[PDB]
Design a protein around this ligand. Structure first.
Ligand SMILES: [Cl-]
Length: 372
């Protein structure tokens, strides 16, 4: 049995074999896989292949997790639509694309079943035998419709879903927090590529209970990337009196450079950007300090403590009553994010020894093996 983190922008599969969890690399050596499905004139693409060619915006589906289990009427759905390059329709939302010369329509769980099919075959390549049993995780705030449609996606992918479990719960499991006895309050701080969730759980003799959930479904690492891109678009304007914004390729190349610089600023205090012939044949060689990055992202950083306080408020718990702080999602690697959380909790330690990109898949694989 495997554990699958079916994330908004990225998915991760793990397996418990030989006393240990392996997080499994896809074909490209990537241990997380984009939650993207793409339909072309000749083929269906999933994951790494799909996100790359996103050239094909109307037929490259992403963010299915935002749709899954929701009604077309749901304000969330009506609002997310406007920023999707692909069509949506009532059937119940469905995504509509062109595939092999024809218009096709998929429910969100059909799209997510294809991403799960990828995660399944990734696991099977590694294991050297077929996989059928799986635990899939969801945000704690997901309702029963969202959980059912997520489970259905797993079934469609040919999986027997042992359990739908909460992502913060999976994260806790990954750290063995559920096998310590007495009673324990755990705060999961989950800042992903596209979403931010704060969950407080109580663990009692191994039993879980969600006490509070807060966050921002439209706040993540990609927002921090955006701050950097706009900053450098402006820096380029100032320096060269040209606007690269209208050239798609320049923006993309700048964006990937910013993604690289943001990664670098998590382990270094400065990052260099070097782009040959970015625009109008002008090479763009520049740099940014971590401090400059943090400043440009000031509001975003401030946005993260608010759901923390509200979570505490809803759970009727004080700071000191939290026994464990768990870091999930790649962007929790950002130093300023960790400091802001740790400071708020009076210098407490952060559970971060597990790859924050992989903690949820890790936990789901542990749970899968327990249920087996
Ligand atoms: Cl997510």
């Amino acid at each position: 049995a495997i554990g699958i983190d079916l994330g908004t922008t990225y998915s991760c599969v793990g397996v418990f074999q030989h006393g240990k969890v392996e997080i499994i690399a896809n074909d490209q050596g990537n241990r997380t896989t984009p939650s993207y499905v793409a339909f072309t004139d000749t083929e269906r693409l999933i994951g790494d292949a799909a996100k790359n060619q996103v050239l094909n915006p109307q037929n490259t589906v992403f963010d299915a997790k935002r749709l899954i289990g929701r009604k077309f009427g749901d304000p969330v759905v009506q609002s997310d639509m406007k920023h999707w390059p692909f069509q949506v329709i009532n059937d119940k939302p469905k995504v509509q694309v062109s595939y092999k010369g024809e218009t096709k329509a998929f429910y969100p769980e059909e799209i997510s079943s294809m991403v799960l099919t990828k995660m399944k075959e990734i696991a099977e390549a590694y294991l050297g035998y077929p996989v059928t049993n799986a635990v899939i995780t969801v945000p704690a705030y997901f309702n029963d419709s969202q959980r059912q449609a997520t489970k259905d996606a797993g079934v469609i992918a040919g999986l027997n879903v042992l359990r739908i479990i909460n992502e913060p719960t999976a994260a806790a499991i990954a750290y063995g927090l559920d096998r310590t006895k007495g009673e324990r309050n755990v705060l999961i701080f989950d800042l992903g590529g596209g979403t931010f969730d704060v969950s407080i759980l109580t663990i009692d003799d191994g039993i879980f209970e969600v006490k509070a959930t807060a966050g921002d479904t439209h706040l993540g690492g990609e927002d921090f990337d955006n701050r950097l891109v706009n900053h450098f678009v402006e820096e380029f304007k100032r320096k060269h009196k040209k606007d690269i914004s209208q050239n798609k390729r320049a923006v993309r190349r700048l964006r990937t450079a910013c993604q690289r610089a943001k990664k670098t600023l998590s382990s270094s205090t400065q990052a260099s950007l070097e782009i040959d012939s970015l625009f109008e044949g002008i090479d763009f060689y520049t740099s940014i300090t971590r401090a400059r990055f943090e400043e440009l992202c000031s509001d975003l950083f401030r946005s993260t403590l608010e759901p923390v306080e509200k979570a505490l408020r809803d759970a009727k718990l004080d700071k000191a009553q939290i026994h464990d702080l768990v870091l999930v999602g790649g962007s929790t690697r950002i130093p300023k994010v960790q400091k802001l959380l740790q400071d708020f909790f009076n210098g407490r330690d952060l559970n971060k020894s597990i790859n924050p990109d992989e903690a949820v898949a890790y936990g789901a694989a542990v749970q899968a093996a327990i249920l087996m």
